[PDB]
Design a protein around this nucleic acid. Structure first.
Lengths: 63, 136, 386
RNA sequence: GUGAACAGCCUCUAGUUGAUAGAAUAAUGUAGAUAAGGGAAGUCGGCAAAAUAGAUCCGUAACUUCGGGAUAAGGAUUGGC
RNA sequence: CUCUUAAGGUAGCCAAAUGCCUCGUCAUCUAAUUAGUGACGCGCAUGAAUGGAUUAACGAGAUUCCCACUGUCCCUAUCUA
RNA sequence: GCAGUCAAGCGAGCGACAUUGCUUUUUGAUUCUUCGAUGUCGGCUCUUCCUAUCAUACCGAAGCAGAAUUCGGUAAGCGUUGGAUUGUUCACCCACUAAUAGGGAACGUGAGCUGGGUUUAGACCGUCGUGAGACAGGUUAGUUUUACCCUACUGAUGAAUGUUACCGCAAUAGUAAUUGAACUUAGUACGAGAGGAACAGUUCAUUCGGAUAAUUGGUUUUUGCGGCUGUCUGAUCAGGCAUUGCCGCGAAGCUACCAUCCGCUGGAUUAUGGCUGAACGCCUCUAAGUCAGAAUCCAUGCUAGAACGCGGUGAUUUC
């Protein structure tokens, strides 16, 4: 088995969790829960949401 | 299903009942397809036939080139927006409904598909996997 | 005249009447056929339902498209502490049915099994089997003469077993009691086996094996008085219907001039006795074993209990039996497991299963971690840590 | 006070706190809602509900009794400091 | 050519709220239309202040299609008083 | 409307001229009941029954082989649809399918719905009459009431059996699974070729059913967390009102072929095909006997458990 990474949040998607999305340009996005899948569909930038891996990396939190 | 089917298909959620308009994904000259039936459906007192990814449907061309309009002609569903579960536990969905034209035994009217194509349609139709670019 | 367009009827007439069951235990109507050749052994067991989880495994099904591929399936865990044998009953065959002939109990019965004979325990004198126990006396002539009659006359021998409820986390202190049939051996060996096992325990690993197919009997989740549309799935009437639209329109014709039992009517939904069949066992775990949830391919010391405990049950601390899919019943309820009544030779029946990973993310929400050590590694130090 | 506004909403002076009550939360109702994918395939019939909506700027056809059609149709903007 | 009346339906208009046969025939809209529209007219039984034909603007009037929208429907589920 | 007999004719199978019947889903004939009122067409929704069989099942035959097609018998177990025009009944088209069979139940079903048709009163038109007005002609608008009673059905309690408690037997009643496709057998049997099967085995799916909620999705008064407008508490903090003020996410619970799991195996017989064998010295599945036999029947299995059917077992009161 393989554990995946959530596109919006960076969390780990163990088998059978979340949903997968395939937009017109063949790019694949994996989400762990409906919370993240909705924040993606609202065209919301991950680097602003406080609880995400991209936001913490950008703000240098967790060193 | 059809003469050109390569085998069997595991069930996936129906999402294109009769009356649904789904994009045309080939270069045959059509802009969209209009489902009027689905091959391989059953009967119930008020249950509408519904097609899924891999089904051969009978369809008409509503907006498209004049020669292709005003006549019933088959098709194959290449994408769908309803989310379905694979036996490997992953729910997924495309962002649009699409399909391509075909003759009764699964040969495309055209020579190129634009966009991703579900692996369940490719494995079931030898003449769709040939022209597919990216399969998910 | 005739109905214009045909359609199948709604509901099944074999499951009538749709009423509340007589007892919270669903009773084991039929036990497996006997052959005297094999050793003595139980045919059923008693347990308590816990909850559900997820399993990932390979598929050994030659021919299918998913041969030698991963697949994700659901499973349900049953808390099964060992059962205690406390008596034996013998049945004679008569032209108008079977019939018990004698019940021989053990000497010392636990408090939780003799709670089953009191409604108001807290103000009782605890007089239960008090005179019966004086039968062992100095010799035990009375008891051994009773067992003599079972060997002489009975054709079917059964055993009374009470579950050890105190170990499970349920707030209930009263212990269930039920009869299990003994299969295997002569009628003489059957009653001897029971006598040796009075007050002794019988574990789950001595009844079921890993890839067996078993049947579940239990009383379904109740819902109360229910309308026609959700009791039989009838069609709903159009929007512009005076006097309700969740109702069956025609409840009969003019003649026979009486409402027929076949019509859909409102009433009790849930709380019935059901007997599902053909459930494959996937693991027979051990209570005193850490890494109950580990596998060959996983290798992490973690038990079967998710994070935060099974919702509405608690934590698993005894043996358990996880089966493929759903079994009738709701969580915390008594569930009785039975051996199948026929030899199933299908590919599914004979398939052998080796798991790859058991889930333990919390079922109280969208769990993200499998172990508390995994949470700490991903997140790092928090304020509430030292 | 908000706003174009004796619209809707909140408040001051003044006035009422009046309409049999207590307890649970079954089915069927009345009144108010929301729904994945399809989008009228329902029905005699888009009946009912939904979608549109204020203001500023741009753009606006056939026909016309030359006054109209016209808010046609179709777009863009809108907060705080 | 001929019988006949006081005169024998002219300009217009139509399977029209007026056409029995009738679901008239031809074309357009649909995958399919006893529906809609445009045409033809020996029109049972159209037609001239019994007013005829047309007509912009208006209509809680009758009828058909398209875009948008939706629990009408596929197929039901849930919440509140 | 349906079915036999005759056997001229046509060509296993059709059938004229005659002639004997059956049914009450057609329409007539009659006027027995109802005019101090039995709510009328169609559609919707739902149960059950008949067979005069479209499909599936089991048998027989045609035509010098397959394949396909056709015809005949037993058979009501199980199924028999989505739609454009029309108020339709009926009918005709498009489409899928194994197939898209015919009927009954006060022309089933209006205190179950709807009110499109017909069938009041308003209004228009064509023809008819001097007129008021006529027309199973066309068009338009038109109030659809009452259950709390008895029974019937669905569920729910319950005195009396010394008392009380636990575990069971099983009379009777109900019952359920259904159909298609692909891989292999196999380009094999068969046939000049073109073409082209079947039994055993495997993987899926259609229709129905019983549950369950790990996961996915729906729902939100968790008024849980955040955000936004107006106004009020002097400001900030924290809050009030806007019939749940609006917006995003939202655990628990409920729930969806919108999700997942499960849907048993033995016997006896019908048509039919045989063994031995007479009637009828031969012949013959039959008259005695007997072997194999199916969507058929009965058990196994699954639901209830007679509140007037039954058994085993515990304890039975120190003012």
């Amino acid at each position: 088995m393989k554990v995946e990474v959530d596109s919006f949040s960076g969390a780990k998607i163990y088998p059978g969790r979340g949903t997968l999305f395939v937009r017109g340009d063949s790019k694949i996005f994996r989400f762990q829960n409906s919370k993240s899948a909705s924040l993606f569909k609202q065209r919301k930038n991950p680097r602003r949401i406080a609880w995400t891996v991209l936001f913490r990396k950008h703000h240098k939190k967790g060193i | 299903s059809g003469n050109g089917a390569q085998g069997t298909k595991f069930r996936i959620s129906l999402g294109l009942p009769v009356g649904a308009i789904m994009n045309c994904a080939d270069n045959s000259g059509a802009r969209n397809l209009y489902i009027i039936a689905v091959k391989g459906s059953g009967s119930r007192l008020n249950r509408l036939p519904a097609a899924s990814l891999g089904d051969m449907v009978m369809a008409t061309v509503k907006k498209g080139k004049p020669e292709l309009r005003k006549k019933v002609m088959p098709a194959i569903v290449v994408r769908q927006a309803k989310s379905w579960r694979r036996r490997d536990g992953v729910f997924l969905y495309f962002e649009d409904n699409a399909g391509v034209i075909a003759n009764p035994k699964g040969e495309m009217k055209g020579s190129a598909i634009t966009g991703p194509v579900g692996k369940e349609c490719a494995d079931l139709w030898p003449r769709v996997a040939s022209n597919s670019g990216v399969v998910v | 005249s005739h109905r214009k367009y045909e359609a199948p009827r709604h509901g099944h007439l074999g499951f009538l009447p749709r009423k509340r069951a007589a007892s919270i235990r669903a009773r084991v109507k039929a036990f497996p056929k006997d052959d005297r050749s094999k050793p003595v052994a139980l045919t059923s067991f008693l347990g308590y339902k816990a909850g559900m989880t997820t399993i990932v495994r390979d598929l050994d099904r030659p021919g299918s498209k998913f041969h030698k591929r991963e697949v994700v399936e659901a499973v349900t865990v049953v808390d099964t502490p060992p059962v205690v044998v406390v008596g034996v009953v013998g049945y004679v065959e008569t032209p108008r049915g079977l019939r018990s002939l004698t019940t021989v109990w053990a000497e010392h019965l636990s408090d939780e099994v003799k709670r089953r004979f009191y409604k108001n325990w807290y103000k009782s004198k605890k007089k239960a089997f008090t005179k019966y126990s004086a039968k062992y006396a100095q010799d035990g002539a009375g008891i051994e003469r009773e067992l003599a009659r079972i060997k002489k006359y009975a054709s079917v021998v059964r055993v009374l077993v009470h579950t050890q409820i105190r170990k499970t986390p349920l707030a209930q202190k009263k212990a269930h009691l039920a009869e299990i049939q003994l299969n295997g051996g002569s009628i003489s060996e059957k009653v001897d086996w029971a006598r040796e096992h009075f007050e002794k325990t019988v574990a789950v690993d001595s009844v079921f094996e890993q890839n067996e197919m078993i049947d579940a009997i239990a009383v379904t989740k109740g819902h109360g008085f229910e309308g026609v549309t959700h009791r039989w799935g009838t069609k709903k009437l159009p929007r512009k219907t005076h006097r309700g639209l969740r109702k069956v329109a025609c409840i009969g014709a003019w003649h026979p001039a009486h409402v027929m039992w076949s019509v859909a009517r409102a009433g009790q939904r849930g709380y019935h006795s059901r007997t599902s069949i053909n459930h494959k066992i996937y693991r027979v775990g051990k209570g005193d074993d850490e890494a109950n949830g580990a596998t060959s391919f996983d290798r992490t010391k973690k038990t079967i209990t998710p994070m935060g405990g099974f919702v509405h049950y608690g934590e698993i601390k005894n043996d358990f039996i996880m089966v493929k899919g759903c079994i009738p019943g709701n969580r915390k309820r008594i569930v009785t497991l039975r051996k199948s009544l026929y030899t199933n030779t299908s590919r599914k029946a004979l398939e052998e299963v080796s798991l790859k990973w058991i889930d333990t993310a919390s079922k109280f929400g969208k769990g993200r971690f499998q172990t508390p050590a995994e949470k700490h590694a991903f997140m790092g130090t928090l304020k509430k840590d030292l």
